[PDB]
Swiss-Prot record, chains A, B:
<dbReference type="InterPro" id="IPR035090">
    <property type="entry name" value="Pyridoxal_P_attach_site"/>
</dbReference>
<keyword id="KW-0808">Transferase</keyword>
<feature type="site" description="Can be labeled by an AMP analog; may be involved in allosteric regulation">
    <location>
        <position position="146"/>
    </location>
</feature>
<feature type="binding site">
    <location>
        <position position="66"/>
    </location>
    <ligand>
        <name>AMP</name>
    </ligand>
</feature>
<dbReference type="Pfam" id="PF00343">
    <property type="entry name" value="Phosphorylase"/>
</dbReference>
<feature type="site" description="Involved in the association of subunits">
    <location>
        <position position="133"/>
    </location>
</feature>
<feature type="binding site">
    <location>
        <position position="33"/>
    </location>
    <ligand>
        <name>AMP</name>
    </ligand>
</feature>
<dbReference type="GO" id="GO:0005980">
    <property type="term" value="P:glycogen catabolic process"/>
</dbReference>
<keyword id="KW-0663">Pyridoxal phosphate</keyword>
<feature type="modified residue" description="Phosphoserine">
    <location>
        <position position="732"/>
    </location>
</feature>
<keyword id="KW-0547">Nucleotide-binding</keyword>
<dbReference type="InterPro" id="IPR011833">
    <property type="entry name" value="Glycg_phsphrylas"/>
</dbReference>
<protein>
    <recommendedName>
        <fullName>Glycogen phosphorylase, muscle form</fullName>
        <ecNumber>2.4.1.1</ecNumber>
    </recommendedName>
</protein>
<dbReference type="GO" id="GO:0030170">
    <property type="term" value="F:pyridoxal phosphate binding"/>
</dbReference>
<keyword id="KW-0007">Acetylation</keyword>
<keyword id="KW-0321">Glycogen metabolism</keyword>
<dbReference type="GO" id="GO:0098723">
    <property type="term" value="C:skeletal muscle myofibril"/>
</dbReference>
Length: 823, 823
């Protein structure tokens, strides 16, 4: 009876007894054979093999925390950007080149198979990709972290450059199935919606509700090489499949069928403010999750164990809910609703635990883009919750009054309920009220949630504000992505670095050495040949390799400045042309990110970049003196192979607009010079690397704040800076497009007359700087010099670090670097 | 490529190497362990374990036919009443023993786990059951055969008699999946609804249609110990839904997200009238399969003996289509629409081939019941099919005129268009024109299709009409259901019988061997007591495993007299009650059968039994001399359990209504004596058995026609038979319903004033039989003597023989009983 144990299921490190497993699954799982099986079949066969070799470990980890009962720390997020599991299972488990030998002794090619894998489309950018990284490093740091979010049938679109434009051609990543996940029909809970309250003797009822079933799916995330492998648990919406008539509800009219789609497509599309669905989605992910959070606190070990009627006195000891951004916020009104209403905890006692369990990571530098909801939206889907939100509030605000008698303008600046032309609830204030700890994403930024945006909140509970300077992850962002460069490091410092990281600091001593100089430009010249290969293979281009390899891969969006780039690269096309022999360093510039539907300036700016392309790379006057590639469909699998041929990381956003920056850290690692306007995280990177090692141009936070106080007007620069007069002219007189001359005319007036982001004011400073970048390119080795002093610097911009910080001052729980036995 | 071999995995016969994979499926394939895992995960880990045995042999057989290249025969049926895999998968492949031993040692009672499997609601009744036996024997007889059905997500209801009334209840059998089915998304093909027929060039096109995608799901069908495993390809109707921006359709208005629903539920449900849903389901199956048949005809091997068209010339030699009932019928215009429109063969080359290729099995004896569909319905979802039924109908009538020159009414009776109020097409006459053979499913029923129902048709193509009487399979319905009856029979004649049932005739020499007579009786006694325990466990009331087990389990319908049984039952009830001290042979009548929603007298007659048993199973005056049990939710599962435990087999259909039986041949075989009218099925079953060993009773067909001349007037028997007049007044005063007397009034009134099925005509002689029954049963020695005589002569009813004749006489292919090796 006890003979159903984890014993024997594989022979690990054996090329041959996993060569017995690639066969096992092709036949018995996939029901295919060698005369009929396809590439995508042998990737699904390989996918399964490394997977039994994951879920072995997953049983015993999972076993461990029942016995050992840690504080289970759930990270709540509506975006989870993983993106290609196979290789990353292989390294954090070991089996990679022991999977390479089997799959060539078999006669395949594990790298050709690897590219059959669609990206696990649960994201869009850095809110998913941060947590996707924190999921790797919590798993490595011994921590009992659970990641819970929603499983999107389609994620967010796949982009398509056609005619120069973006066509958002949808991503059905999951149609051929997904190796890595397990469905769990057995642990389906309901999500109730709409309904109404109805009070009784002891509490209140929220009867009359519509329901949407919550079905869980388990991807696992391995910890790096210490054998603990954790659970992502992502929800799927099932419409109640009582339907055809039961309740006799359709009777007189079927059209409640419109429930089936408007409920069930909670789970089909991720977004790219004013939407019942974004809130329905939001309430979906927190309800199901928190019901599961309560069943491991009771059932799994406290099922039996009480003391205090298995009260929640020991809840905050055992559980910690970390709301990433404002999208989990209904975790405070829903947690309060279950403890008070379903169990029967005092409003006061239940709110005790609530704040103690919860804390909230803050991502915006802007107060204007900070989630708030309409009360008519609340009150109708969520009545009890519009009611508990009202009640948390005067309770909070009287606590404010105790600490500020008579200061009336604060009971409307602290308030939960916004007023006037649509009374809204400010969700970020709701969070700060029930979260014992808020953190800024960068140092600077935590200051500006003290000094500017939650000033009152920091005056009254001074201490909730923490800082955790968000990093990246060695495994993904050095080892998978640039292994030639993780090759030449290993043996010098000791592999202790990938899970203990400012040790990168040693290679600093190694700078001078003219071995390391010639060493590294190979990685970068090989990389710039392999990526300059891939370029022409998928899609196609005609490139240098050797070029200055210049890249900026962000969202196409005004305040990140793809535009500043475009002006400059029209200075470059035009001066090199003017004197056609005017030698300068030939750059291949790559701009790329998706836009966001119903964003025409961010549709326009793709089109200017795909208007240039034509006249530069096809004006064979220029030849290979200048090239601008647009990266169609930039996502996490492209993220790990363009930072790779990063000479130049152009992170050129207006000062004080970026709240931080993550795809900038995994750039001064791979060997990339970061040239950009100072704010966000372009800062601490230079406070580490030294300003002289960086290339910080242009304005700053402080003199930008100056500028819109004595009038900012971009023209004035139009009348002075003679080449910008040139490029504005040629921009406007159908140079790029003879067929539609006017075309970039909506962008001219934008650039001229209502430029919120001062693209023209940071022009000149940018060019008498990217002259310092070009002229230094062709000083081919003291170029290669600084590219080491950036690498050495690293360990703060590593998410292991950040997780230890969250671990330690906010959660409690002490980290680990120990290897759990077996597999 | 060679390294990836089948060579195996199959340590096969080995306990250790499969306690070992019941562990892998529990930990690595299902991801559970002994601390989380429940019964469902254990049966599923067993279920998964056996089908690695199953799918290796699947691989191997499929390969074989690719190599050999046999004539393949596809069998279209809208119901495959598959019912419960595992125990049969294990007996057809031998692992009852090893799987028992491995789960013995594991701590798991292998009986218990089995009864967690959900009966696959891919069927409804007899029409579904013969296909399933026609697939077991198509596989034991080595034929290259396919099963093409609909993968009903929910199926026809679950009976749930609540307080006495049949409640309808949905069946999601596949909640926690199906281990046995393997979805083949690679083979999704489109099914074209509605549209316009535009005419051009050498042909016609069908433009403007609406695609639904038919997605295939493969299930293995293993043969008893011969190592072949054939296919069953079920089609899932998955709505084309890229309905999110694409086509400039949604947004404008998502009024039209109904092609989600009425595309999607071509497969959510099975039926119980003029429904476009029923015809949409009928064409969906046909579109997805004929395009899959030609997919396989074109791909496996033939487009090289292409000498001529991958010729359809040879299509009838590599293909054979069986049309079980007129439901696959649109397959004769679909195999004409592709061959003519698409392939571009001659119209008379498409008919020469369409008639040589497909064939029609008919199952009816009552003509109204022959299928018809309105040309308004066809002119719409099937524009071009209407035009192929219109040129078929026209050319067939030429054939007819020349054959019977001048007979203007023969042209109007031999037609496929048919009008009066609503111009319908006759689908059964469509089948005779497009099939090389038409066949009855029983001897006399096959005569009265050329004697009466298609007689003109017959005279014009006499050579099409064959017969083939129905049969059970020896494996599910004697080995699985009754392994007890199985040891004893094999101990004497050997085990060659399972694959050749006529060897049961050999047991007829052991009639007078009173070891065997006390032995068979033993056998039937544990059967009656493992079953009698089913009852006070799942369900209850009181059993007495001695009594004469009298089951009638047909579906609830007026033409099959559940009512005659109700009246015999209270006649015994009353004789037991006026004269308590008389000795009476006690009986337990068990009536089970799924009524059929909408139909009220079936609804109402079930409430009879659920009120007769309440009144008589609570009479401490009778004590236990009678008990009446409605068997809730008859399915393949309880037939397994019921036919096994029964003594009398109640087959009381009105003479002239039944065509052939199939339910009978399971009780005849498992040693039960038929009581039954001479009518279609009971007739070959008494040719073999000898009338002696049957309880033939009452009214014969021309006895039914004698009274259907002079006229039925039930009242003449009411005032000529006192024991009837007796219970009409039991009913009418409301004995069985003290709170609602008048409840069974419309039954009383039906019965007398308009009983189209002649309950009272048969009453007196059916009773003078029930009690001769009671004579022989109270004579256990001579009961078994007559029961030996049943089980021995029943061999003619193996589907191994009904198939041995289709194959031979119709499909062409010749039966084979040899092994393959298949690791």
């Amino acid at each position: 009876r006890k003979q159903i144990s984890v014993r024997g299921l594989a022979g690990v490190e054996n090329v041959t007894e996993l060569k017995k497993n690639f066969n096992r699954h092709l036949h018995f799982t996939l029901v295919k054979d060698r005369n009929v099986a396809t590439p995508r079949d042998y990737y699904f066969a390989l996918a399964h093999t490394v997977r039994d070799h994951l879920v072995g470990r997953w049983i015993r980890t999972q076993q461990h925390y029942y016995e050992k009962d840690p504080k289970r720390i759930y990270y709540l997020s509506l975006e989870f950007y993983m993106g290609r599991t196979l290789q990353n299972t292989m390294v954090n488990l070991a089996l990679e080149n022991a999977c390479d030998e089997a799959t060539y002794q078999l006669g395949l090619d594990m790298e050709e198979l690897e590219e059959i894998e669609e990206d696990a489309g649960l994201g869009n950018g850095g809110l998913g990709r941060l947590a996707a990284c924190f999921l790797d490093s919590m798993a490595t740091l011994g921590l009992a972290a659970y990641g819970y979010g929603i499983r999107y049938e389609f994620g967010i679109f796949n982009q398509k450059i056609c005619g120069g434009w973006q066509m958002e051609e949808a991503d059905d990543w999951l149609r051929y199935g997904n190796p890595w996940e397990k469905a769990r029909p057995e642990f389906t809970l309901p999500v109730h919606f709409y309904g109404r309250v109805e009070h009784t003797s002891q509490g209140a009822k929220w009867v009359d509700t519509q329901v949407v079933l919550a079905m869980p799916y388990d991807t696992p995330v391995p910890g790096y090489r210490n054998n603990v492998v954790n659970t992502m648990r992502l929800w799927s919406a099932k419409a109640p499949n009582d339907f055809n008539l039961k309740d006799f509800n359709v009777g007189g009219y079927i059209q409640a069928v419109l429930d089936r789609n408007l409920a069930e497509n909670i789970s089909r599309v991720l977004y790219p403010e004013g939407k019942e669905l974004r809130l329905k989605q939001e309430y979906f992910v927190v309800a199901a999750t928190l019901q599961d959070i309560i069943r491991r606190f009771k059932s799994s070990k406290f099922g039996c164990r009480d003391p205090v009627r298995t009260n929640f006195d020991a809840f905050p000891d055992k559980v910690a809910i970390q709301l990433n951004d404002t999208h989990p916020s209904l975790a405070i009104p829903e947690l309060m609703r279950v403890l008070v209403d379903l169990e029967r905890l005092d409003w006061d006692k239940a709110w005790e635990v609530t704040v103690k369990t919860c804390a909230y990571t803050n991502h915006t530098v802007i107060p204007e883009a900070l989630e708030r909801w309409p009360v008519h939206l609340l009150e109708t889907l969520l009545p009890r919750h519009l009611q508990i939100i009202y009640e948390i509030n005067q309770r909070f605000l009287n606590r404010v009054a105790a600490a500020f008698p008579g200061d009336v303008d604060r009971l409307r600046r602290m308030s939960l309920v916004e007023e006037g032309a649509v009374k809204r609830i400010n969700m970020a204030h709701l969070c700060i009220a029930g979260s014992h700890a808020v953190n800024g994403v960068a140092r600077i930024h935590s200051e500006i949630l003290k000094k500017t945006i939650f000033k009152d909140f920091y005056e009254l509970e001074p201490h909730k504000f923490q800082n955790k300077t968000n990093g990246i992850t060695p495994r993904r962002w050095l080892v998978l992505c640039n292994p030639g460069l993780a090759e030449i490091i290993a043996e010098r410092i000791g592999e202790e670095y990938i899970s203990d990281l400012d040790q990168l600091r040693k290679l600093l001593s190694y700078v001078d050495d003219e071995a390391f100089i010639r060493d590294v430009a190979k990685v970068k010249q090989e990389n710039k040949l392999k990526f300059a290969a891939y370029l022409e293979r998928e899609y196609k281009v005609h490139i240098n390799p050797n070029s200055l390899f210049d890249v900026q891969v962000k969202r196409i969006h005004e305040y990140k400045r793809q535009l500043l780039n475009c002006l400059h690269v029209i200075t470059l096309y035009n001066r090199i042309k003017k004197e056609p022999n005017k030698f300068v360093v030939p750059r291949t510039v790559m701009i790329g990110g998706k836009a966001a539907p119903g964003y025409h300036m961010a549709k326009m700016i793709i089109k200017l970049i795909t208007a240039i392309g034509d006249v530069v790379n096809h004006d064979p006057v220029v030849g290979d003196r200048l090239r601008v590639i647009f990266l169609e469909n930039y996502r996490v699998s492209l993220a790990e192979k363009v930072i790779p041929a990063a000479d130049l990381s152009e992170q050129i956003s207006t000062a004080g607009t970026e709240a931080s920056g993550t795809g900038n850290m995994k750039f001064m690692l791979n060997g990339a010079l970061t040239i950009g306007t100072m704010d966000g995280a372009n800062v601490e990177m230079a406070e580490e690397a030294g300003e002289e090692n960086f290339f910080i141009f242009g304005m700053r936070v402080e003199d930008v704040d100056r500028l819109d106080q004595r009038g900012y007007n971009a023209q004035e620069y139009y009348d002075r800076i003679p080449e910008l007069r040139q490029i504005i002219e040629q921009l406007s007189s159908g140079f790029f497009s003879p067929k539609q001359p006017d075309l970039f005319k909506d962008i001219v007036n934008m650039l001229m007359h209502h430029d919120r982001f001062k693209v023209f004011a940071d022009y000149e400073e940018y060019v008498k700087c990217q002259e310092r970048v070009s002229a230094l390119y062709k000083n081919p080795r003291e170029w290669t010099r600084m590219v080491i002093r950036n690498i050495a610097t690293s360990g703060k911009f590593s998410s292991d670090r950040t997780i230890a910080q969250y671990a330690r001052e906010i959660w409690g729980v002490e980290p680990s670097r120990q290897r759990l036995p077996a597999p």
